[PDB]
Amino acid sequence: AKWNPAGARRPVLDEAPVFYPTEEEFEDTLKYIESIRPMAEPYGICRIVPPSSWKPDKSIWEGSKFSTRVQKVDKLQNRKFGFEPGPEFTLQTFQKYADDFSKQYFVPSVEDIEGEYWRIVEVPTEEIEVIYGADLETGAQSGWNLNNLPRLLVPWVYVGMCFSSFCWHVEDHHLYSLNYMHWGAPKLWYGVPGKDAVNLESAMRKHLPELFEEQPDLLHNLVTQFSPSLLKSEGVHVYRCVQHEGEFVLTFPRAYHAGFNCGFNCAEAVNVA
Ligand SMILES: O=C(O)CNC(=O)C(=O)O
Ligand SMILES: [Fe+3]
């Protein structure tokens, strides 16, 4: 039903690296990624802010329908078999649903929302359910237009609202993931480097044993959130970054990531080799 500010459980984490390419570096997507890899790879994830140069509809906004799934945020980590289908929406109607939910639940800052999100997942006091559009199949000249990367695997669309989540997972086939936020509220990302994958899975098996018994293949299901604070206590390196609209997040082969949204937003991501 509503916010408890004093009950906040915001993770205390190191920030993932942020990159500010120049127009020249930016002119070659694949080449730029390659160049920052040595620096960014040990973190599993990184944020890329495009230069000023870079700069990318009623019938769609109001016309194109998509379906959603329902998430019980209070059950993502602690529960005694996943995301049921939700209503169909358009961007317009989804936004209004999304905006009213936040207005009533709570203008909070990103850190306010993040502290509340983890309160709901670690120590819930009520059922909170939320809706997201994921897996929506779409729908200069540079690979930053995600539709062009498979060339030089198809782009996928994500519509989020406050507290909607993407639970811990690695990309298929040790692929990179490149994610662009088209517009809307910030998305919180938590990343673990490939070399720490074993520590992460093992921390999860240790603390959520009964969950693994009934679902031996949890780690593939995308249905389980797990606190960075718990990970941190098991010696796992978790890095945070906050993605704003107009910004990319890049995930490295074999890196685990998870996160949630601070409000209504729209993003597109693709896998790259
Ligand atoms: O954007 C989301 O909600 C989730 N995206 C991913 O997990 C992907 O970019 O690797
Ligand atoms: Fe992903």
Numbering used by the authors: 139 to 194, 200 to 223, 262 to 287, 296 to 328, 350 to 362, 378 to 498
Publication excerpt:
In this work we have identified a rice histone demethylase, namely JMJ703, which specifically demethylates methylated histone H3 lysine 4. Our results demonstrate that JMJ703 is essential for plant cell division and stem elongation and specifically demethylates mono-, di-, and trimethylated H3K4 in vivo and in vitro. Finally, the fragment spanning amino acids 139 to 498 (termed c-JMJ703), covering the JmjN and JmjC domains, was deemed to be suitable for crystallographic investigation. The c-JMJ703 molecule presented a canonical overall folding of JMJD2 proteins and contained four of the five domains defined in the structure of c-JMJD2A: the JmjN domain (A139-K199), the long β-hairpin (D200-T271), the mixed domain (L272-V377) and the JmjC domain (L378-A498).
The high resolution structure of the catalytic core of JMJ703 (c-JMJ703) in complex with cofactors and substrate peptide reveals that the overall folding of c-JMJ703 is similar to those defined in animal and yeast JMJD2 that are H3K9 and H3K36 demethylases. The final model was best at a resolution of 2.35 Å with a final Rwork value of 19.3% (Rfree = 22.5%). The electron density indicated the presence of substrate peptide in the c-JMJ703-NOG-H3K4me3 complex. Three of the ten residues in the H3K4me3 peptide (ARTKme3QTARKS) were visible in the c-JMJ703-NOG-H3K4me3 complex structure. This complex structure provided a view of the substrate peptide-binding mode of an H3K4 demethylase. Compared with the structure of c-JMJD2A in complex with methylated H3K9/H3K36 peptide, the methylated H3K4 and its two flanking residues adopted a different binding conformation to c-JMJ703. The methyl groups could not be defined properly in the c-JMJ703-NOG-H3K4me3 complex structure because of low occupancy as indicated by obviously higher B-factor for atoms in H3K4me3 peptide. Fe(II) also interacted with the C-1 carboxyl and C-2 oxo groups of NOG. In the crystal structure of c-JMJ703-NOG-H3K4me3, NOG formed three hydrogen bonds with the side chains of N404 and K412 similar to the JMJD2 homologues. Moreover, NOG interacted indirectly with N490 through two water molecules, a finding that is not observed in mammalian and yeast homologues.
